[PDB]
């Protein structure tokens, strides 16, 4: 008895697809024209375009089924969408890092774990980018899509910079916990905690490619607690 609902719905859907193909034809063609012609030099303008494109296609009952019947630049549309998504994703990431707060209500274990996961997420994102970037640039260049954001001096550079800020917060936490109570340097919990500090610092340093004065002062301050 659910099958009657199913069948009705399916029927209404197929109907709607014939409807969109027959009454929204030159609309679709208008879109395809706009997509083919499009080019950009700043990724923001592309974002605006993709936003517009999504809103427009959202008027088709189903992208796949309808566009199937038209001379539709599938490759370029997918690439536009992809670049929009990737850049937005990387930017959400840089923001999450720069504005990360280390909750004073958390004890050292969960707080440091949070920072560790954030670091792993950053590392994976950037590594994925670096391994797909050449290919992507080739493609995008062909399609008129900005690629400067993919360069070492684009978003990945920004993320690398923000990771150093993360290092600052991490060492701040380690120093703080190491001061909150007083014990001997030979307590395996305390030694371990100190080492977590140092290892995280070094991991970030190798990742980003250097520190600032402030980072450095924190690193020295830690390495002089041994």
* Cα 167 from Cα 170, distance rounded (Å): 5
Q: What is the DSSP string of the chain?
A: -HHHHHHHHHHHHHHHHHHHHHHSHHHHHHHHHHHHH---SSHHHHHHHHHHHHHHHTTSS-HHHHHTTS---HHHHHHHHHHHHHHHHHHHHHHHHHT----TTS-HHHHHHHHHHHHHHHHHHHHHHHHHHHHHHHHHHHHT---GGGSTTSHHHHHHHHHHHHHHHHHHHHHHHHHHS---TT-HHHHHHHHHHHHHHHHHHHHHT---HHHHHHHHHHHT--
Of 177, 225, 175, 167, the closest CA to residue 199 belongs to 167
* Residues 6 or more apart in contact with residue 79 via CB below 8 angstroms: 139, 140, 143, 145
Burial class (CB in 10 A: 0-12, 13-18, 19+), 36: middle
- Under a CB-based contact definition with an 8 Å cutoff, are residues 54 and 85 in contact? no
- Under a CB-based contact definition with an 8 Å cutoff, are residues 140 and 79 in contact? yes
Domain ranges of the chain: 2-72, 90-223
* Residues 6 or more apart in contact with residue 213 via CB below 8 angstroms: none
Residue 122 has, within 13 A of its CA and on its CB side, a CA count of 30
* Cα 176 from Cα 206, distance rounded (Å): 24
Of 156, 173, 162, the closest CA to residue 97 belongs to 162
Method: X-ray
């Amino acid at each position: 008895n659910n099958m009657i609902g199913e069948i009705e719905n399916r029927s209404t859907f197929l109907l709607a697809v014939k409807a969109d193909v027959e009454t929204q034809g030159d609309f679709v063609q208008s879109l395809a024209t706009e997509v083919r012609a499009s080019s950009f030099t700043d990724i923001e303008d592309l974002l605006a375009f993709v936003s517009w494109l999504d809103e427009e296609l959202s008027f088709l009952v189903d992208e796949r089924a309808v566009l199937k019947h038209f001379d539709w630049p599938e490759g370029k549309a997918d690439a536009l969408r992809e670049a929009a998504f990737e850049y937005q994703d990387l930017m959400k990431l840089e923001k999450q890092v720069t504005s990360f707060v280390d909750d004073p209500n958390l004890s050292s274990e969960p707080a440091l774990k949070k920072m560790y996961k954030l670091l792993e997420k950053v590392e994976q994102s950037v590594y994925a980018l670096l391994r797909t970037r050449d290919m992507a640039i080739s493609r995008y260049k062909e399609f008129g899509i900005p690629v400067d954001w993919l360069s070492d001096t684009g978003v990945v550079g920004k993320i690398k910079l923000s990771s150093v800020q993360l290092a600052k917060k991490y060492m701040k936490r380690v120093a703080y916990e190491l001061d909150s109570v007083s014990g001997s340097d030979k307590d395996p919990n305390r030694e371990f905690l100190l080492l977590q500090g140092v290892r995280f610092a070094f991991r970030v340093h190798q990742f980003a490619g250097g520190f600032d004065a402030e980072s450095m002062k924190a690193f020295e301050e830690l390495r002089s607690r041994a």
